[PDB]
Ligand binder design. Structure first.
Ligand code: ANP
Ligand code: UAM
Ligand code: CA
Ligand code: CA
Length: 334
């Protein structure tokens, strides 16, 4: 996490309190991750599995998180399989533990999604179609969602802190910053309506869902916010192109294969006008820019490996040159 949060975190005290709030024994806790949030797995008395995610008010308010929890509950009540929030013993979706410094650690729990992450055996057109139908149902459902408290309102796409590349990258990279500013201006020219824009997951990839008996169960809604539906799609495409489970021989051909199957599924559940498909390259480029910033947080600029330096140089050059993320001509899908 943030170093201040790490400095304030008394892990034993927090897990002791969490054990009381969520009715589990300390001995049944497994540490999973600490890079972004603190994430743990546990089992309760009856043997069911749960995921405990801990953040802090320095990163996000309780009410912002409650907006995610409210939306996930709405999706679940409309027949979408998601890792559902679990109320604490006090009937709360988010539990705050004061840190004695004016802030609070924010605890929340979800059901552990059944199954596990996709494997080589799963990486095929059937998966891609299932992802399309899952995403399509999410988009069709979200159209009717209304925020119940103004404090719970999730961000608009352009409010994303990680798009503020000037915060993350060297200030002499004026061309990269020009490219980002210009692309943002172009995306702001797109029309917004209920049928094309809404609250979406915004971090879809195969690290953020399980596959169980041929069905998708998503989790990690922590970046959910208001986007064009085609950006939710584009983010998933970016991610399958970046870390494919099986290497592809030809990036353009794979893009076409993924998209053909995905869209076949998507059409089962939602109606998206073909004109949006042409915007995918622009949204892929925006994601590429966001990742470039992230790599600067990820890497120590003062002790870079040769591979890290090469990756940063590649992203920079691609952004400056406007090299498309994929060579695929999206007009082929029409
Ligand atoms: N509801 C869930 N069901 C099953 N496994 C989960 C669930 N939530 C999280 N996990 C697992 O725990 C890991 C970390 O959780 P995640 O919510 O992705 O953490 P994060 O702190 O947001 N880090 P990041 O992966 O950078 O988004 C995931 O990659 C899964 O392996
Ligand atoms: C450390 C980070 C660069 C890792 C990256 N994650 C992302 O690119 C996104 O989660 C972020 O870009 C996103 N959280 C940014 C945001 N603020 O919405 C990667 C993306 C990814 C793609 C395909 C499969 C995966 O398992 C993953 C994965 O787990 O994470
Ligand atoms: Ca994740
Ligand atoms: Ca996350």
């Amino acid at each position: 996490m943030h170093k201040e949060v790490k400095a304030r975190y008394d892990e034993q005290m927090v897990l002791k309190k969490a054990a009381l709030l969520y009715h589990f024994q300390p001995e049944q806790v497994t540490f999973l991750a600490d890079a972004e949030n603190y994430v743990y797995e546990y089992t309760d008395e009856k043997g069911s599995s749960y995921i405990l995610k801990i953040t802090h008010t320095i990163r996000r308010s309780s009410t912002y998180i409650l907006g995610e929890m409210d939306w996930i509950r709405y999706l679940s009540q409309h027949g979408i399989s998601v890792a559902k929030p679990v109320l604490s013993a006090r009937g709360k979706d988010v539990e705050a533990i004061p840190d004695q410094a004016g802030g609070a650690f924010l605890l929340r729990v979800y059901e552990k999604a059944p199954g596990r992450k996709v494997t080589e055996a799963d990486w095929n057109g059937q998966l891609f179609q299932a992802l399309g139908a899952y995403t399509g149902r999410m988009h069709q459902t979200t159209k009717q969602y209304q925020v119940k408290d103004p404090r719970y309102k999730r961000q608009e796409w352009y409010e994303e802190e990680q798009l503020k590349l000037e915060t993350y990258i060297p200030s002499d990279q004026t061309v990269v910053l020009q490219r980002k500013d210009e692309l943002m201006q172009k995306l702001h020219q797109l029309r917004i309506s209920k049928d094309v824009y809404g609250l979406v997951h915004a971090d879809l990839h195969h690290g953020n869902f399980h596959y169980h008996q041929g069905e998708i169960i998503a989790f990690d809604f922590d970046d959910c916010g208001y986007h064009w539906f085609i950006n939710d799609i584009s983010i998933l495409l970016y991610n399958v192109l970046w870390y494919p489970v099986i290497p592809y021989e030809d990036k353009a051909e794979f893009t076409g294969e993924f998209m053909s199957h995905f869209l076949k599924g998507y059409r089962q559940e939602n109606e998206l006008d073909d004109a949006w498909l042409a915007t995918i390259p622009d949204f892929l480029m925006l994601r590429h820019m966001l990742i470039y910033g992230l790599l600067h947080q990820a890497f120590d600029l003062r002790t870079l490996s040769a591979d890290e330096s090469a990756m940063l140089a590649r992203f920079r050059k691609e952004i400056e040159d406007k090299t498309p993320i994929t060579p695929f001509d999206f007009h082929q899908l029409t």
